Amino acid sequence: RADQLADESLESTRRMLQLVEESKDAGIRTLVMLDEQGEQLDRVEEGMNHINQDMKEAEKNLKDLGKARENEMDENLEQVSGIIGNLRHMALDMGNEIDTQNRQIDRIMEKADSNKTRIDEANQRATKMLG
Amino acid sequence: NRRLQQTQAQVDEVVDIMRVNVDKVLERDQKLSELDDRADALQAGASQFETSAAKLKRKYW
Amino acid sequence: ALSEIETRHSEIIKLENSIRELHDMFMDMAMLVESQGEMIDRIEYNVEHAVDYVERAVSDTKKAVK
Amino acid sequence: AEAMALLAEAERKVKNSQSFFSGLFGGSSKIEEACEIYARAANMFKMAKNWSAAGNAFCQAAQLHLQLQSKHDAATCFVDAGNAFKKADPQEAINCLMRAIEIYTDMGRFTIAAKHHISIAEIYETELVDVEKAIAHYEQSADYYKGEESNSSANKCLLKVAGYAAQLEQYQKAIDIYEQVGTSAMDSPLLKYSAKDYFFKAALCHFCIDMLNAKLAVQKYEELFPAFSDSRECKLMKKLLEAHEEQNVDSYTESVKEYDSISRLDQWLTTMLLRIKKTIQGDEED
Amino acid sequence: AEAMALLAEAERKVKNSQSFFSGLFGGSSKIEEACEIYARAANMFKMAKNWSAAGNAFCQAAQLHLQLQSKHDAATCFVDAGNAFKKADPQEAINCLMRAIEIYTDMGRFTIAAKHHISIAEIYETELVDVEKAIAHYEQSADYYKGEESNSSANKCLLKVAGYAAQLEQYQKAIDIYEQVGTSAMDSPLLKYSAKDYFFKAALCHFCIDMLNAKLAVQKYEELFPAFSDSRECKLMKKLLEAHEEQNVDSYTESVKEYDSISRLDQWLTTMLLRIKKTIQGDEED
Amino acid sequence: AEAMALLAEAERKVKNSQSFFSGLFGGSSKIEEACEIYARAANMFKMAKNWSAAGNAFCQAAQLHLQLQSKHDAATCFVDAGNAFKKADPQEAINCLMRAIEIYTDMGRFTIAAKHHISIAEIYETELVDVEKAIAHYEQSADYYKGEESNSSANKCLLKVAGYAAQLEQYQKAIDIYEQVGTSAMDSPLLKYSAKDYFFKAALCHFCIDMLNAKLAVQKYEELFPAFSDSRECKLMKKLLEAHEEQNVDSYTESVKEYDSISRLDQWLTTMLLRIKKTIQGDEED
Amino acid sequence: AEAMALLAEAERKVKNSQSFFSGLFGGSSKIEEACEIYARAANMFKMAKNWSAAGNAFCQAAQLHLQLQSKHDAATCFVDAGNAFKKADPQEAINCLMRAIEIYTDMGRFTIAAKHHISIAEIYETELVDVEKAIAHYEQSADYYKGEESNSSANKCLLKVAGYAAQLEQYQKAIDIYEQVGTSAMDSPLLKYSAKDYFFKAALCHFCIDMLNAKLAVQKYEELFPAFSDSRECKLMKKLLEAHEEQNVDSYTESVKEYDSISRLDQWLTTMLLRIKKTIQGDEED
């Protein structure tokens, strides 16, 4: 079944062209979404460096307070191959946008638990000298 | 066989990056969830800090 | 010659194969990136405001030592 | 542990003190109590699946909080209330959110304001079916996003605006929105690909123009030939522009049937293409 | 720096004082001091990887913390204990987590309650092998996520619920879950893609329904010839529906063999497919 | 309510106290109060979309906030002012940002300093068209990102530097940048794909070269048609090197006509290809 | 402004008080001041691009910060010092990090202890070439990730371990690691795809066995002939096993020559394939 295999396998490459096309658009959302996520985190760090300071002051203030069939076929596949150019524009950028953030997230979790502790201590030392 | 083998692995190579994408994207999911349990647990104490900092206000101010 | 037309075939299917499976990873990805998105919305939120409440806490401590 | 009891004590305490009750100082320190009371009740209400009650309870804690001077924790509560009413049976799910934005906005938190602003226009459409107020919100919200250089969310909203605008017969205002969102999308190579559909929509949208506003918009489009992406945009458009300038509603209805293959026509397209399929026939029998 | 020594000191100080040791005021700093002690021990226990000694240690520190007045950080300790027992050789991991959720829940922290709730149901399944309760938790948790308008997690959980429900003969309750998770999935064009598999699963699930419960749910689906993503969902289903309505356990077993060429069959599908294969053979020689 | 009123009162209170009003401690609580005032004004101005007034107001609150001794929260305000002026009507967009970086920098926060540093070069390019200063910023910023071992962003900047370096005739200085950004890209198997484009750009960028600098760069590139991605990189390059060595301004112009089929040519490529197209012509008359 | 000036002042103040200087209290308040000094110095040393000086300065500020009691911010300072020496020209990048982990470790912060633990082994390998210690780190770190039940991360590390374990001739110890990371990757259907390469690697690693193991590993592998991913795993392995059992360095190096067409080989594979290619010849030309 020559024509039955050169067309079915081709019929898939066609249902394949859109596939990577559909996944490319779906990937674009990952681009715009991972871009939005990167932004919404720039403010998180901002609020993380904001708490870091205030706490240091507060703590100190408390001490101071305590004391043509194949021609098209190829074109359809070529489009699938060209999409890699877009598939590349994704995995890369965001892929790295992942490291920068994660390494930043950890620094956010730590200080997040750090301030928490200094709050428990400050409260304890404060209770003993309350009204 | 020309264009065939040509377009053959052309994708087998794109099958790798996703293997990296699916993973690097899932590793984040768990890390963020970890921050969700600490960041909140933090403000949870802030509710105490505010009240505690206020009690100190009625003693030295 | 079938020996030549049949060879082409086996190569295309085996090509179609690796394809669809890879595409599967693209889908699951968009599905994963989404779930994560909604989860970060709650993260930032609780954090952002967490800074607002503390911002008011520190502002009071500063005025509680003067 | 009884919500019904807490709601009562909260009320008995939420009241500007005086006489002996006031002593020397008071006010915020008393209203706040009732606030956490209603919150405490709203919680168990949401626990007993009484949502409605939980929502109204949060509304109480919220309003009172405003009566204390703390718009922040308040607005967040209004949001909690909206989250309740939304996944509940009553209404006001729209009121709470508005009462939240009036706060986030006057407070200065436009970022989060737009964050809930879009949720609002999303409910006013999928629920209340009030496209009129919906567009107004999707829009103003995108303006806020555009202020926070959040090009991304801004366009997402604009797309909503124009999208539903073409449904309200606002074809012209729609193409204009598509032009704006198009001029502010080419600066970002992270959107070039999607930028096509914008021109496809803008060219499809017709404010009853009989000229070639579209033939001019399709030309303004920048395409070469071997474009893997561009195949899903103008190539069809031209074929549609010719099927119109020849009152042949048979090649247009055939081209839509064929193009429907290489690119599946979503709801929107179908509706507009039908509004274009009618104009030709109406130009024939006239 | 010895754990045994610390555990002893901790016990020596964890006791409500009275008489001469009390003086005038009790001392929450004592109970908390003991907490820090046990925590310090549980840490080195986890260091040497004795887990069984770390977990039970955290429990102590955790319990004491409650005797203080700090439910928050306490619950977090309960989590540390659960994480220990989990990755340990004994059990208790289930008790710690229940003791954690009672806190996050009564505290007004459902986001987090559900975060550990899903973990719980994941344990009661991958470990204790008690799906009948696991599903119960996957559900209540999906309800909490559904409250925080966090469609995502809510759906993840629902998927777990139905997924294992089909494996527990609960085929109908499964399709129901698939219907809900399918309706609240189309609203967002972000799930349109995966929205297929849901219909395929649902149509496959059969509560011994002697009809076209699926043939009615197959046409309800909006498939499109050009849509190639769809060719991986109902196209097969129809062919399976005919193979069942004709008690032909050959056309079905062949269509599944062919479909396993364009779309690989995961473990799930396989299991259910064979279940239907049996409903057919069974209706032949039955 | 009125911004004018706030701006005025803010002026009344923004002054070191004296006499009885000062008592013993005038404190910075006043300068800070004024800050909150101007911010409250800049806010309603940003609402009214007056921007200009909003920005200048933020500048006021910011400056005063510096008189408070709290650089951090101040700089953030300078950023707010920047976001205002930027997407506004007047200028100052560049000033505010410079006044922001001087703070993040002296403070020790290079991570965020580079964040606004790139925004700066991006405005100084897309607006002021001050390429020579923009490159200086894209570069210094890339240095900071490189320090934070944030390879990512660092490369996102270097690409800018080189990309706009070729436009300023700096062809050699461009290829070198591509060489560095390539070497520090092979060490990571997560950049294997993109590594192509780098070699394509570098091989295209010609500082009036005569030898086989490109034939040597293309040789350095490990290509194997079976590693197909490469097709969109050097396969064309070699053809270009042949049409160049053969002073054939027809084959090169045909090759750029064909490649524009398999891989579209962006602005950059175009301009440079024409420059090479001229090097050939100018060599034909040699 | 001047680093030398600050470093000197810092020195003069960094010293436990005594005599009339100590009086009643003295310590933290001073040592901290010096910390801030050195940090301010290391900063300008970093802007000046002297790094070395910046790093040694951070080492000072950090050490002193420990002399005050505040281990957290200290450890983070050591991290800054590490980033400095790392992007610098001297060494010490290894010491700063060890001094950071000792802290995050005995503190109870294992999650991050492992975060920097993998960075450490990543430097101890790419630079110091000290593979034995690097592996000891990748391993202990994976143990910590496994402790937190953070499977994924633990696997990333294990993959590193085994990967470099096979390079150090430790083939058997590698196949086992691949086994474990394999049985702990099938529980999650999100790793289905991934489960292949593991079996291919584990079957390639040979502890100089005289047959099976690999023939047994390929057997344990569950493949579905009509599969697509799996084509890049066992199918080849079988051919290699036959080419090994039968001394024929012509059927092995050929099959790898063909396989290198449908699935490009990475440095790792090549290294090991050649090692096997050598075992064959070393059994042949013997």
CATH of the domain at B54: 1.20.5.110
Q: Is E196 in contact with E217 (CB distance < 8 Å)? A: no
Rounded CA-CA distance E145/E153 in Å is 6
Residue E196: CB partners within 8 Å, gap ≥ 6? E229, E230, E232, E233, E234
Using CA atoms, how far apart are residues G120 and G86, in angstroms rounded to an integer? 11
Q: How far is it, in rounded angstroms, from Cα F134 to Cα F130?
A: 6
Q: Which amino acid is at F253?
A: T
- Residues F3, F176: Cα–Cα separation, whole Å: 54
Question: What is the sign of the dihedral through the CA atoms of F220, F226, F229 and F231?
Answer: positive
- Biggest alpha carbon–alpha carbon distance for chain E: 90
Q: Are D163 and D272 in contact (CB under 8 A)?
A: no
Count of structural domains, chain B: 1
Exposure string of F143-153, with b = 16+ CB inside 10 Å and e = fewer, is bbbbbbbbbbb
CA dist., res. D31 & res. G241, Å (int): 79
Q: Which of G148, G19, F20, D174 is nearest to B38 (CA)?
A: G148
User: Coil, strand, or helix at residue E225?
Assistant: coil
Interface test with B, best of E101, E111, E112, E156 (most B CBs within 10 A): E112
Q: Do E261 and G226 touch (CB under 8 A)?
A: yes
- Mention every residue, 6+ apart, whose C-beta is less than 8 A from residue E14: E30, E31, E34, E64, E67
Q: Is G205 helix (H, G, I), strand (E, B) or coil?
A: coil
Tokens 């310590």: give the residue: G27
Q: What is the DSSP string of E12-65?
A: HH-S---TTTTBTB--HHHHHHHHHHHHHHHHHHHHTT-THHHHHHHHHHHHHH
The amino acid present at G126, given as its one-letter code, is T
What one-letter code names the amino acid at F20? F
Residue G199 neighbours by CB under 8 Å, 6+ apart: G178, G182, G217, G218, G220, G221, G233, G234, G237
* Residue reference for tokens 């470990």: E127
Burial zone of E183 (CB within 10 Å; 0-12 exposed, 13-18 middle, 19+ buried): exposed
Using DSSP's 3-state secondary structure scheme, residue B13 falls into: coil
Q: Which residue has the tokens 């496209």?
A: D131
Please answer whether residues F27 and C64 qualify as being in contact, where contact means their C-beta atoms are separated by less than 8 angstroms: no
> What is the domain extent for residue B53?
1-61
Phi-psi region of D69 (alpha: psi -120 to 50; beta: other; left: phi over 0): left
Q: Which residue of F has its CA nearest to C59?
A: F29
Test C63 with F29 for CB contact under 8 angstroms.
Answer: yes
Q: In the block, which residue shows the tokens 């790898």?
A: G256
CA G101 to CA G112: how far, in whole Å?
8
| B45 interfaces chain C, CB cutoff of 8 Å | no
Which residues in chain C are contacts of F25 at CB distance < 8 A?
Answer: 66
Q: Minimal Cα distance from D225: which residue of F? A: F261
Is E123 exposed, middle or buried, given 0-12, 13-18 or 19+ CB atoms closer than 10 A? buried
Q: Which ranges of chain E does DSSP label H, i.e. alpha helix?
A: 3-13, 28-47, 52-68, 71-86, 93-107, 110-126, 131-147, 151-167, 172-186, 195-204, 215-219, 234-244, 251-262, 267-284
Whether the CB of F23 is below 8 Å from some CB of chain C: the reply is no
Query: What's the Cα-to-Cα distance from E69 to each of B47, D40, E63, F106, rounded to whole Å?
Result: 13, 18, 11, 43
Count other C-beta atoms under 10 Å from residue G285's C-beta. Answer: 8
d(CA D245, CA D106) in angstroms, rounded, equals: 53
For chain B, the distance separating the N- and C-terminal CA atoms, rounded to the nearest angstrom, is 87
**Residue E49 with chain G: CB contacts under 8 Å:** 143
Q: What's the helix, strand, coil split of chain G in %, to 5?
A: 70, 0, 30
Task: For residue F161, give the H/E element and its range.
Answer: helix F151-163
Chain F neighbors of B9, CB-CB under 8 A = 226, 228
Contact G170, G161 (CB under 8 A): no
Q: Determine, for residues E191 and C31 on separate chains, whether the beta-carbon distance falls below 8 Å.
A: yes
What lies within 8 Å, CB to CB, of G286 at 6+ separation is none
Closest to E76 (Cβ–Cβ): which among B33, B36, B41? B41
Residue F64 in contact with residue F11, Cβ under 8 Å?
no
Residue in the structure block whose two tokens are 């999906």: E142
Query: Measured on CA atoms in the order D151, D157, D163, D169, is the torsion positive or negative?
Result: negative
- Do residue C45 and residue D112 have CB atoms under 8 angstroms apart? yes
Tell me if chain C has a CB within 8 Å of the CB of A47: yes
Give the span between the Cα atoms of A118 and A123, in whole angstroms.
Answer: 8
Question: Do C47 and A61 count as a contact with CB atoms less than 8 A apart?
Answer: no
Collapse the DSSP code of B1 into the 3-class scheme (helix H, G, I; strand E, B; otherwise coil) and give the result: coil
Chains that touch G (3 or more CB pairs under 8 A): A, B, C, E, F
CA distance E111 to C41: 12
| Nearest-CB residue to C30 (from A2, A26, A43) | A26
HSE-CB for C62 with a 13 A CA cutoff:
19
Q: Which residues contact E106 (CB under 8 A, 6 or more apart)?
A: E71
- Cα dist. E278→A122, E165, E218, E237, E271 in Å? 68, 19, 21, 17, 11
Task: Using CB atoms, list chains with 3+ pairs below 8 Å to chain A.
Answer: B, C, D, E, F, G
**Alpha-carbon distance D143 to D118, whole Å?**
11
Return left, alpha or beta for E71; rule: phi > 0 is left, psi -120 to 50 is alpha, else beta. Answer: alpha
Q: Give the whole-angstrom CA distance, residue E270 versus residue E253.
A: 11
Q: Judge whether G149 and E126 are in contact, CB under 8 Å.
A: no
Compute how many other C-beta atoms are within 10 angstroms of the C-beta atom of residue F44.
19
- Phi/psi at E23 (nearest 5 deg)? 85, -80
Distances (CA, A) of C62 to A59, A116, C27: 10, 19, 52
C-beta of residue E42 within 8 angstroms of C-beta of residue E55:
yes
Q: What is the torsion angle, in degrees rounded to the nearest 10, for the CA atoms of residue E76, residue E81, residue E86 and residue E87?
A: 110
Per the structure block, which two tokens stand in for G139? 């391993």
CA dihedral D265, D267, D271, D273 (to 10 degrees): -10
The token duo for E279 is 């409903």
Residue matched to tokens 């996050």:
E104
Residue with tokens 């923009």: F134
Across the interface, whether the CB atoms of D262 and E226 are under 8 A apart is answered yes
Q: Partners for B (CB, 8 Å, 3+ pairs)?
A: A, C, E, F, G
H helix intervals, D87-190: 95-107, 110-126, 131-147, 151-165, 171-183
Question: Which of F228, F229, F230, F232 should be substituted to probe chain B, the one whose Cβ sees the most B Cβ atoms within 10 Å?
Answer: F228
- Tokens (6 digits) for F261: 């089929």
How many CB atoms neighbour CB A45 within 10 A? 20
Name the phi and psi angles at E25, rounded to 5.
-110, 150
F226 chain-B contacts, CB cut-off 8 A: 5, 9
The span from the CA of D100 to the CA of D85, in Å, is 14
Residue G247, min C-alpha distance to chain B (Å):
30
Question: What b/e sequence results for E43-73 when a residue is b if at least 16 CB atoms lie within 10 Å of its CB, and e otherwise?
Answer: bbbbeeebbebbbbbbbbbbbbbbbbebbbb
B36 touches chain G (CB under 8 A): no
Q: Select from G35, G73, G104, G122 the residue whose CB has the most chain A CBs within 10 Å, as the one to mutate to test that interface.
A: G73
Cα gap A114→G269, rounded to integer Å: 45
Interatomic CA distance for residues E90 and G100, integer angstroms = 33
Label residues G51-63 b or e (16+ Cβ within 10 Å = b): bebbbbbbbbbbb
Q: Test A127 with B52 for CB contact under 8 angstroms.
A: yes
Q: Which chain C residue lies closest to E152 (C-alpha atoms)?
A: C35
Q: What residues in chain D have their Cβ under 8 A from chain A's Cβ atoms?
A: 111, 150, 152-153, 156, 189-191, 193-194, 226, 228, 231-232, 262-263
Residues 172-191 of G with CB under 8 A from E: 187, 189
- At A21, list the tokens: 């096309």
Chains with 3+ CB–CB pairs under 8 A to F are A, B, C, D, G
Bridge partners (DSSP) of residue E23 are E25
Q: Which of C42, C52, C54, C59 to mutate to test the interface with D (most CBs of D within 10 A)?
A: C52
First vs last C-alpha separation in chain C: 97
Query: How close C22 comes to chain D (CA, Å)?
Result: 20
* Tokens 């429900």, residue located: E165
Distant-in-sequence, close-in-space partners of E272: CB < 8 Å, separation ≥ 6: E166, E204, E205
SS3 string of E183-207?
HHHHCCCCCCCCHHHHHHHHHHCCC
Give the burial string for G73-103 (b: 16+ CB within 10 Å, else e).
Answer: bbbbbbbbbbbbbbbbeeebbbebbebbbeb
Burial of residue F54, with CB atoms counted within 10 A of its CB: 0-12 exposed, 13-18 middle, 19 or more buried:
buried
Q: Which of F107, F149, F229 to probe by mutation at the G interface, max G CB count within 10 Å?
A: F149
Kindly tell me the sign of the dihedral angle through the C-alpha atoms of E109, E111, E115, E118: positive
**Dist CA G119 CA G16 (whole Å):** 35
Burial label for D13, CB within 10 Å (0-12, 13-18, 19+), is middle
Looking only at Cα atoms, what is the longest distance across chain D? 90
Do residue C18 and residue G229 have CB atoms under 8 angstroms apart? yes
Say which of G72, G73, G112 has its CB closest to residue A106.
G112
Token pair of D16, please? 């500007």
Q: E strand or H helix at A88, and its extent? A: helix A84-127
Q: Does the beta carbon of G190 lie under 8 angstroms from any beta carbon of chain C?
A: yes
Residue of C nearest to G191 (CA): C25
Q: How far is the alpha carbon of B48 from chain C, nearest alpha carbon, in Å?
A: 10
Burial G235-267 (b: 16+ CB within 10 A, else e): ebbebbbebbeebebebbbebbeebbebbbeee
Please check whether residue D280 is in contact with residue D243, taking contact to mean a CB–CB distance below 8 angstroms. Answer: yes
Q: What does R_g of chain D's alpha carbons equal in angstroms? A: 26
Q: Is A26 exposed, middle or buried (0-12, 13-18, 19+ CB in 10 A)?
A: buried
Does residue E19 sit at the G interface (CB-CB below 8 Å)? no
DSSP state of G246: T
A107–chain G Cβ distance below 8 A for any pair: yes
